[PDB]
Amino acid sequence: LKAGNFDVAYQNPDKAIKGGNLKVAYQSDSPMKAQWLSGLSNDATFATMSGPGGGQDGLFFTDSGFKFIKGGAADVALDKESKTATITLRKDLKWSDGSEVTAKDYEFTYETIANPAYGSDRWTDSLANIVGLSDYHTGKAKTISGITFPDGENGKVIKVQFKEMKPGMTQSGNGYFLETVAPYQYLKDVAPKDLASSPKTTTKPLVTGPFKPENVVAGESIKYVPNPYYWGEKPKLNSITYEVVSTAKSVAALSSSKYDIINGMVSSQYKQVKNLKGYKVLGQQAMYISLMYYNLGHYDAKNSINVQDRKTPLQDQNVRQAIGYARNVAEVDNKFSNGLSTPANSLIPPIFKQFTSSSVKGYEKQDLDKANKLLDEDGWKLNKSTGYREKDGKELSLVYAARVGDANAETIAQNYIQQWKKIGVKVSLYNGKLMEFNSWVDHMTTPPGANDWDITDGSWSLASEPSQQDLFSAAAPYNFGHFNDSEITKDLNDIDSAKSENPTYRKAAFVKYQEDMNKKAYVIPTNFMLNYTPVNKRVVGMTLDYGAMNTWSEIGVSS
């Protein structure tokens, strides 16, 4: 398995010893916030650090494309005809204290999120598709009517009844049903308003994973030890320590071999890491897309609809395409990215092999000739005097709301401005400088939208169900440029249709959608990215493969 030039796995030539201690860090300049219940946890640092303990008690295995498979802590089965997900917990699925994981523990997850008394931030509208769940969430019902227990609360089976099935229900991270358990017998006497701050969910939790946390130092670290009651394969290691390390100390920690693995390192430090003797640097395709938006309308919040009514030359498809073909994204990546940004051909990242294809062509190759011809054949005629194009007497001049974020953000934005000058388009920065991120978010997300930018960049960390509805549909507030296109709406609906329960049909629908988006060019894909992880050469069985389900049990050290 490769990811760009990177290996996905470190194939250690040496055999693992029995036992050993693995030293893992997560790069963060902020303290971790320990919260073992998925529904109550809002800190990405700790979510990742919870890995050895079960990742906040996730139930389901997937393949490398995040499609559910059987054989994890539980199985999930979908039945179209009865509109039901059936969750079957393993007979020997236990909490770390030896107590049984039961149907009630699965249902209780739902209460931690949907009952506002616990203070979760994780309710989504998607959950309203479970029968009875909205009524629970608003306090109209004392129980969740769509969740039933064929063999009782102390049984191992849970049925979840939906109003409508969705084809994304076979992908982890779909959000239509939840994928974690909570130890109801351990927590049932804690007041909901006190659950998040209780020892029992912070320093002294029950877990289901291959390791349990023997010690938690708040903000800093976890000492993991084998969980005797884990249903699966007993781990090789005697322990794992998992700590936060600051950005400024990460490279030195590798130099001294303080950590066997550091997770979450940022793209800029890669040049300092690549050279380090004693480490293998692994890479993996990220669940990430960056793209360029054009401002084409406004958002009507009252009616929840994007209206594509902005006066701008970007209403012309030829202009949108030309501005895309003019960029030198490949060249930019080659100068600056260390192979960690690679040009996007489409809106769906290539890690989703079941939902995209490299055969989709976008704007990944600069074509200044094509850009110039497009503007020509559309009446944007160049000047002698100025080097810029005019049409019905008005100059082709646009505002670029570029933003701070990338370590060469200023240099990249200027490079694009210069490329656009080559095709006779005059582009200037919004207020003559890069936008701060919080400014940029406010500008793009406050309805009805501003009229004072033409081009901007966005970048998303995608869930493992790569839903496009929430980003680009006619009703989406995140449709930042406010396009509204009947063909794209049809394409989006087809992706989520009953016909798309068939994987081959769904792939085709995703592919058509990506083609249509590139042609229409309301937005332009910019980059995919790779994540990297340095791994000490003594570690055995380490891999970034998303389909690797037992890495914490398999991983060992050679000395």
């Binding site: 989504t124 509208d125 998607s126 991270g173 959000g175 990430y288 978010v441 966005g458 970048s459 998303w460 960390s461 995608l462 869930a463 169900e465 839903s467 929430d470 980003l471």
Partner: peptide, 6 residues
């Protein structure tokens, strides 16, 4: 509610 800025 699935995807995040980043």
């Amino acid at each position: 509610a699935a995807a995040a800025a980043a």
